[PDB]
């Protein structure tokens, strides 16, 4: 039954993939090869070509992503060879470095060995490779509350955070056969960070805000023609709203709006003043300004949406269905100023694709 699943996802994936790659005539033979391997081993191994194209396809099918125009230039690193924890760690350091690229960020995915019998070869505990710790000490909130449970799980295993608002979590992960994950402190020289300043308002620096350059999702399974790559971290660059309007603004995250309001010299007393809205805008201006001042790639939600419009035209012109999740595609500020807001999307799940999977702690 799982063999039938795998076989079926394999047939559908290879036909689509080779058709796209112009290699249609090779399909029958490659499929025959695959059927034996699954008969003999209970699985199969992607070629380099397939793995790269599956990764890209998976990004192109990610309904919630506004950034998909650039799906086909994804930079795919194949690390199915890794067998040791040192090799996993060094792969992850390398990805950080090669994806950061001194600020000129490269959309990059590093692919580790797939699950076998639903048994994971490498289990990565981080949600993102770079992410800040979160603490809640008897009333006292420090850092990023999203990270509270992972931070506590790291601190079980003998890591200790300095308890700044921006402690970097260690890389933490578990190898098949070990009962406990290992953790490694990130080398600071690998992590770009950006101080948040405002173009006009010098006092904004009094907030002492910063964010990291590169968002590297490290907790989603990439699935390609029946094969389950649970450990396959990927990155793009940020859209400014993600930092400016959620990570720094949500009440359940850094919750900076009142402080923003103060330093930009408006009152946070009356809803009718639209102080949250004004503050959100200046904070978001800030973010894009600071990342550009520092040479770190970033996109604003207007330019992102325009690019996504182009992705829509391209799909149709290529004769492919478009899928999307309207609720995630719309930016959380000035959504109606984008074309996305004014149309609907088909939120079907097409594979290959990225998927959530259970967190090992919690």
Ligand X SMILES: C[C@H](O)[C@H](O)[C@H]1CNc2nc(N)[nH]c(=O)c2N1
Which residues does the annotation mark as catalytic?
65, 68, 237, 242
Site string for ligand HEM, 5-44 (x = CB under 6 A): ----------------------------------------
First to last CA, the chain: 31
Q: DSSP letter string over 73-103?
A: G-EEEE-TT--SHHHHHHHHHHHHHHHHGGG
- Does 127 bind ligand QJ8 (CB under 6 A)? Our answer is yes
- Does 66 bind ligand HEM (CB under 6 A)? Our answer is yes
17 among annotated binding-site residues = no
Positive or negative: CA dihedral 344, 347, 351, 352: positive
CB nearer to ligand QJ8: give 97 or 242: 242
* Token representation of residue 235: 């990155």
CB nearer to ligand X: give 186 or 330: 330
User: For residue 267, what are the contacts with CB-CB under 8 A and spacing of at least 6?
Assistant: 261, 273, 275
- Does 345 bind ligand X (CB under 6 A)? Our answer is no
User: For residue 86, what are the contacts with CB-CB under 8 A and spacing of at least 6?
Assistant: none
Q: How far is the CB of 15 from ligand QJ8 (least distance, A)?
A: 28
- Does 149 bind ligand X (CB under 6 A)? Our answer is no
Helix, strand, coil percentages for the chain (3-state, nearest 5): 45, 15, 40
Partner from ligand X, ligand QJ8, Cl ion, none contacting 219, C-beta within 5 to 8 A by type: ligand QJ8
Positive or negative: CA dihedral 307, 52, 62, 101: negative
Q: How far is the CB of 239 from ligand QJ8 (least distance, A)?
A: 5
Which chain residues interact with ligand X by CB under 6 A?
327-328
Numbered residues of the known binding site? 65
Which chain residues interact with ligand QJ8 by CB under 6 A?
127, 215, 217, 219, 234-236, 238-239, 242, 356
Which chain residues interact with Cl ion by CB under 5 A?
215
């Amino acid at each position: 039954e799982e063999k039938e699943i795998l076989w079926n996802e394999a047939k559908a994936f290879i036909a689509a993939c080779y058709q796209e790659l112009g290699k249609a005539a090779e399909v029958k033979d490659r499929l025959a090869d695959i059927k034996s391997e699954i008969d003999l081993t209970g699985s199969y191994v992607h070629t380099k070509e397939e793995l790269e194209h599956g990764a890209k396809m998976a990004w192109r099918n990610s309904n919630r992503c506004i950034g998909r125009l650039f799906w086909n230039s994804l930079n795919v690193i194949d690390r199915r060879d890794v067998r040791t924890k040192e090799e996993v760690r060094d792969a992850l350091f390398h990805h950080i470095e090669t994806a950061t690229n001194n600020g000129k960020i490269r959309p990059t995915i590093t692919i580790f060995p797939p699950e076998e019998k639903g048994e994971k070869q490498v289990e990565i505990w981080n949600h993102q490779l770079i992410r800040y710790a979160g603490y809640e000490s008897d009333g006292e909130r420090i850092g990023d509350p999203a990270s509270c449970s992972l931070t506590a799980a790291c601190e079980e295993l003998g890591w200790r955070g300095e308890r700044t608002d921006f402690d970097l979590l260690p890389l933490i992960f578990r190898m098949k056969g070990d009962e406990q994950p290992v953790w490694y402190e990130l080398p600071r020289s690998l992590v770009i960070e950006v101080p948040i300043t405002h173009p006009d308002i010098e006092a904004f620096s009094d907030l002492e805000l910063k964010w990291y350059g590169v968002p590297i999702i490290s907790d989603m399974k990439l699935e390609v023609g029946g094969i389950h790559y649970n450990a396959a971290p990927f990155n793009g660059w940020y859209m400014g709203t993600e930092i400016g309007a959620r990570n720094l603004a949500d009440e359940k995250r850094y919750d900076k709006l009142k402080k923003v309001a103060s330093v930009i010299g408006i009152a946070a007393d009356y809803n009718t003043d639209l102080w949250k809205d004004q503050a959100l805008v200046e904070l978001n201006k800030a973010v894009l300004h600071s990342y550009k001042k520092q040479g770190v790639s970033i996109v604003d939600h207007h330019t992102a949406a325009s690019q996504f419009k182009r992705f829509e035209e391209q799909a149709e012109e290529a004769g492919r269905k478009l899928t999307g999740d309207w609720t995630w595609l719309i930016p959380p500020i000035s959504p109606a100023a984008t074309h996305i807001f004014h149309r609907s999307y088909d939120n079907s799940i097409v594979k290959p694709n990225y998927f959530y999977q259970d967190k090992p702690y919690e």
